[PDB]
Design a protein around this ligand. Sequence first.
Ligand SMILES: Cc1cc2nc3c(=O)[nH]c(=O)nc-3n(C[C@H](O)[C@H](O)[C@H](O)COP(=O)(O)OP(=O)(O)OC[C@H]3O[C@@H](n4cnc5c(N)ncnc54)[C@H](O)[C@@H]3O)c2cc1C
Ligand SMILES: Nc1nc2c(c(=O)[nH]1)N[C@H]1C(S)=C(S)[C@@H](COP(=O)(O)O)O[C@H]1N2
Ligand SMILES: O=Cc1c[nH]c2ccccc12
Ligand code: MOS
Ligand code: MOS
Ligand code: FES
Ligand code: FES
Ligand code: FES
Ligand code: FES
Lengths: 305, 755, 151, 51, 164, 164
Amino acid sequence: PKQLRFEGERVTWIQASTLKELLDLKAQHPEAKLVVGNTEIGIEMKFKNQLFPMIICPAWIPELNAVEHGPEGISFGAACALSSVEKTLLEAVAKLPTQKTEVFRGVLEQLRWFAGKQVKSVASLGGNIITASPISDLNPVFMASGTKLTIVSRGTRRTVPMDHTFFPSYRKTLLGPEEILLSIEIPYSREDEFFSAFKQASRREDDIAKVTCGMRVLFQPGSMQVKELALCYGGMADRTISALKTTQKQLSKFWNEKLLQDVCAGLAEELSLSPDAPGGMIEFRRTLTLSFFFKFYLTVLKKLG
Amino acid sequence: DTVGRPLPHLAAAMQASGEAVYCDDIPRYENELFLRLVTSTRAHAKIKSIDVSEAQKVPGFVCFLSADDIPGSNETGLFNDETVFAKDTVTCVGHIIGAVVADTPEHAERAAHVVKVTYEDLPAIITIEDAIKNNSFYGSELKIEKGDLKKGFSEADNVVSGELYIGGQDHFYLETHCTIAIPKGEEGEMELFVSTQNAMKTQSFVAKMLGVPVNRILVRVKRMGGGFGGKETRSTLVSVAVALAAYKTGHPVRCMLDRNEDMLITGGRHPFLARYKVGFMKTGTIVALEVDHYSNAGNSRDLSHSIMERALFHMDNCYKIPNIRGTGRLCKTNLSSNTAFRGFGGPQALFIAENWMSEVAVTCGLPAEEVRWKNMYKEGDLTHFNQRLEGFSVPRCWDECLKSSQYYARKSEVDKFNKENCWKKRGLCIIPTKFGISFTVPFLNQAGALIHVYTDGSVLVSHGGTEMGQGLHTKMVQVASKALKIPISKIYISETSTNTVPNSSPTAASVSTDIYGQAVYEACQTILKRLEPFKKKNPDGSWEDWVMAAYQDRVSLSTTGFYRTPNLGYSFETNSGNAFHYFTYGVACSEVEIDCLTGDHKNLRTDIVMDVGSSLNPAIDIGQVEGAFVQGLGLFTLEELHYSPEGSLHTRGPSTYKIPAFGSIPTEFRVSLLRDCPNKKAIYASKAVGEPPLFLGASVFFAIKDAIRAARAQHTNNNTKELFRLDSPATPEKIRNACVDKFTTLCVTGAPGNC
Amino acid sequence: YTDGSVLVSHGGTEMGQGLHTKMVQVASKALKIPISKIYISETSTNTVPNSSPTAASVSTDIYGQAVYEACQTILKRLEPFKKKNPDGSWEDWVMAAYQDRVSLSTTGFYRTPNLGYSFETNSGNAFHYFTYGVACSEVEIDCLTGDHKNL
Amino acid sequence: DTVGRPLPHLAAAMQASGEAVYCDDIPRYENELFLRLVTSTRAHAKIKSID
Amino acid sequence: TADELVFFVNGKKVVEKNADPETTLLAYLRRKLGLRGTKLGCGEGGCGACTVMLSKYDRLQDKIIHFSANACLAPICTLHHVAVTTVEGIGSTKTRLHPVQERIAKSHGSQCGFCTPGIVMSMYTLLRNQPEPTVEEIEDAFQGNLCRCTGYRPILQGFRTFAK
Amino acid sequence: TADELVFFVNGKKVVEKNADPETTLLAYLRRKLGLRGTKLGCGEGGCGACTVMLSKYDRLQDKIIHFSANACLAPICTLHHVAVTTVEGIGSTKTRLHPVQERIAKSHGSQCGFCTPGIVMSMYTLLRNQPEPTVEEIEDAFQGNLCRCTGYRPILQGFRTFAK
Ligand SMILES: Cc1cc2nc3c(=O)[nH]c(=O)nc-3n(C[C@H](O)[C@H](O)[C@H](O)COP(=O)(O)OP(=O)(O)OC[C@H]3O[C@@H](n4cnc5c(N)ncnc54)[C@H](O)[C@@H]3O)c2cc1C
Ligand SMILES: Nc1nc2c(c(=O)[nH]1)N[C@H]1C(S)=C(S)[C@@H](COP(=O)(O)O)O[C@H]1N2
Ligand SMILES: O=Cc1c[nH]c2ccccc12
Ligand code: MOS
Ligand code: MOS
Ligand code: FES
Ligand code: FES
Ligand code: FES
Ligand code: FES
């Protein structure tokens, strides 16, 4: 392959053949817009009348398409189609012990009734992440699991676990103007570690007010004593958020009715919505944040027993 | 003779191969241009300026059209209360203000987006409540009354009163609105290809806007990718705009709407609010009913009045009510004008009926099926509008559905399930329906045909009806073949056109098969009458021989046919005269399982028994039953339109407006056509099928309501006779909020609560 | 149509001989309405099937009769509405007929009577009638060139 | 009643203006092609080959 | 100075010398190539009316791959060295219908017909990847395709004949 | 490396950037500009169905001159800086007819109508040169226009009204 240039009435498109080319072009033009599947950009251009006069397509780059099995998880290049992620994870779940695939199973649950085969065959993993919709079904799972993101520019390279700080504001991520997401490592589950993901069965607004979540608990070895707890939600704000104030309070507590009560009390407060919050369905969304946690609570008890 | 055989839709193979031509599939002329509507972003405001300076910079821009460009009249709409292009004021978001014309649809789109409009807001009215508070109505109250309401209510053991709301519905035909207009350049002549159920009004409205005689305008309709009532009138919004562009430029012009435009501009089903009061005995027998209906009509009259008339005609469903008063008011609001949608006011009124009937059963503590059966009409009874029920087959449909669905056994299994599960519940309901067949406006119940037999014996049939997927042309070919006693292979229908059959009614009201079948039949009779001498002289010859002999003897092989439905004409000022020719009937039983923690649900099983008389084509009729039922399931359970407080539609495409999907349909889905029930009143003993089955989708809604009642018994309180309000659509939000428990109340947090 | 405008179609074609003009004049006379209310757009096989070629000089004769017959059918159908509204207009009568579900579309047909000459009996009418004329012409020839003037 | 009157040909004004449409005056579709007949140059002959 | 864009449609080479990055495959098929089988139903990926099959030789897998895609969202500028198959590429009434096309028509799976090309292409793509699918794989194949007319039952019934 | 061809049709500027020397004005008017009033009747100069008026500034005579020409034989490449007038350039039923157009129509000078545009343009050209022509000048104006329908008498009679 070689780099290609296409020129339109309004837009210049560069098809990058190598990672070095992509990073050079992004340094030369930090405002250049990346496009892989165009399943978000096409909507932005048509329906939100966005215009990006320079587009770079990195779909051909080997590094952005690589699937790699490591000691700590499965790494997907950022241009990998969701269909490919789904296939790889289904295979992993089929062959590996249940205790190692709790996070994988969560991703698969979020992908289950998620667009047709048509969308999933071209929608990239990195595209969903960087799009940063408040109602992404994937970012809550990546946040709750501490999924590691490898981020690169001309002369920089850094790997960060996704946490609450990665989404500072509406549709924004903690990336530099020049940076591109290279790869995403979805971790194996450890001993005494459990995971669930849930999502609202309705959507009424373009990118707000659909509850979706990832929930992780790590216990002290062989115990019901909480060592780590993460509950991350989409559709409750203008970005993916973590109920940190609530979860911090449960550390060293035991997995019982008192914890159920306290977490539910915390969620009702921390995630409270004003009567006029964008998207409405105020009562329903609060009820779901609690009902989803209840399901997680019961599921973790069944896994513990 | 293929009448009664399951012949596939005649265009099915071409549809599967992508060879069937829809309006936008027609080749473009070398010089053909594209139109994009420019539309209001405010519910109610004065237009202060329109700036096209930025639009003129777009490559390929031709012109901007507005009110000032119209040569004839800017007054349009069924009741002449609309503008083609808004002039001084806009009265809904989506109100058409002008149009851009350009050399490509991409260029038209680009240009339209940068047209800048400046507004001065005016007080807007959006909700039914807004409208009632402001006395904002079209026309006066509609009413049907029978018996003595005072007295009826005196004799009642129990009285229940309440309020209920049913949301509207977007048509979501897979093919949006589309028109091509070809100006000829002679004498005002124009030929249009349109996705419309109403070529006649298209022709008239175009002629009126241009200020030319109707005979100058030719409208052609090959087929639509769905109509569902949404192309009965609203298609003229696009057609008239494109016609103007064609006139102004002298070029052919076309426009196909994007989904988001279509959902915003073209109108949907009418939302309804009902306030009701029912009086009944401890046995569940109904003695008095009062219902005040209000529809959200939007910003013009359109078909709103007739829709409310049909609602009032169906407030009884299948139940005899001796003392009854129904009224209706059309709310005038700053929303896109609502219009015809499969069922045409019927589903709303029927939903309201089944809601209070459900509450009667609960209040009496009796099984719902028992209460429905007890209150059912009998053969020969008069409706509340005093029409006799002749051939009343609901009891047969009911008995057969109960048996084949194994209702009573499955009811026990539902009870067992609910006994054993805390956070999931099942529900099961069986619901009847009757639907009156005919336009409620007498003069629309007329139909024309034109038939030619060519000298090779091949036959070309033309009739007033349009094909929108319902298989009308298929059925007309089956009818012609039977009537003429020749194979279907000798007959062809090409399209619907205003120069073959003039003055046609819209293809609507489920009667097209009935009325065009009669028109086609009569034309066929005339042909047979003319060929009879030649058949006599050559009884062993072929059709071809007879046709050639007739031709050589200078006998005409071309004729019209015409039909007008007899004995129709209901008077609101006497409460007498036939509103309908006959009624179509059916029964549905559905079972659901709800997730009490999430509000999601599974459609487990549906059984339907439908009285369609002697089907002309059971494959097509079963297809209409299934399709209609699923559209009803959408109306009652999935499909929710949502507006900002400013009156702007939020739900403008499939990502935010959920029509039934492959995975939405009942896991076990059974449909039977009732046997041995010929209908003397229609062509070859058949019955209209298009709209009647839609309301049966409500069986899913009432199963869901049953499941919710179980959840409330589990976690909410101990009152088994409790009435709770459940509006339509019963979305996950409404279902979840109704399962009051330690989560909805926050009792799980340690707080005191109402569970 | 429901505006009172009339669309006439017949089997004959226009080639400059003014057939459509004559058919409009006939239709206007027969219906007793101005020519401005009547239009002929084209000749087409899906409106009038099995048409003879436009030939033999008889198009006015035969399509004129067909149009006349269709017009009479229309008049018969409109007559009751004329009687209910005798001070009214063409347009009023047409709309009244439409709203009473009376068809405003009809065919017309004509077959020339008593034709059928036989070459084996030398009898039977070959023609319906004969057209006649006389012309007198004067010329001057140039005997030296063969040119001439039609005087 | 105009029968017996010298009414001009109905299309004459449009004929004089070049607005009357004849067959080839009809606009062409974007994809429309053109045909030209290939014709015998001999009064009577066997066709041996076409190249 | 622009590179040429080279792709295939129904086995035939397309050389686009002046590709505009804004141009969608759906626009290209319908308005440049005149293949109108593939339809516009929403423009936002939800309805599947514009469904086509895409094929390419995946250099990273060393394998030819076949998948479905919404032509309404696919920029032509992503398609260099990709082969597109549309409904008219698999069969026609003028040649012979593909079994997918024959079965949906005869099973009464097509009413208005507007969704039928997209559904045909979804089923065709499945069979191209798995010629012996299970009943279960057959329903999952259509999450991206909407039909307003049929209530879906007949479509699934006709297609279930391809199972196991 | 070709120069631009620039001419005017009915007062509107035509900039042909890739003129083919083999292109006739009749082909250009009909098939590029879509002005179909001017007709093809022979392609060899004998029938005048394709008659248009040409105007140019004469240097030697120091004036604008107007003359008629057969569009079927005029190479567009001879027309640089020339103004073309066709039948649609002088009047129409949508606005107002020119007197020449009205008179030929009302005088029964048009039957099938195919020669009418060319004859109109021949008469129009005469009047542009000589607003008060003689009867003799009127008949000479038409040696290049054929009519198969009228027998010519009504055309001459109608246009006689411009004379004396
Ligand atoms: C019909 C449909 C249904 C959907 N349903 C759901 C759903 O249920 N739940 C859900 O969560 N999502 C859903 N989506 C969203 C979908 O997952 C995303 O649109 C998709 O993953 C975006 O990937 P893409 O390759 O198409 O992105 P593109 O449109 O090509 O790009 C998206 C954004 O990411 C940026 N980007 C892409 N790659 C990189 C890179 N590696 N580094 C830095 N920036 C990059 C681009 O610049 C752009 O801002 C749906 C989409 C469709 C069309
Ligand atoms: N496939 C299909 N079926 C359909 C429709 C449609 O648009 N597509 N419209 C419905 C409506 S609203 C009516 S009134 C009837 C009209 O056609 P009919 O009178 O031939 O039944 O078809 C119904 N069934
Ligand atoms: O009664 C059904 C119906 C459908 N369309 C119309 C239009 C006018 C009156 C009645 C109706
Ligand atoms: O009467 Mo159907 O067009 S709603
Ligand atoms: O009879 Mo004229 O067409 S020779
Ligand atoms: S047109 Fe609806 S998914 Fe492409
Ligand atoms: S057959 Fe009409 S949308 Fe499917
Ligand atoms: S076409 Fe006959 S002279 Fe030009
Ligand atoms: S009018 Fe026919 S050639 Fe002159």
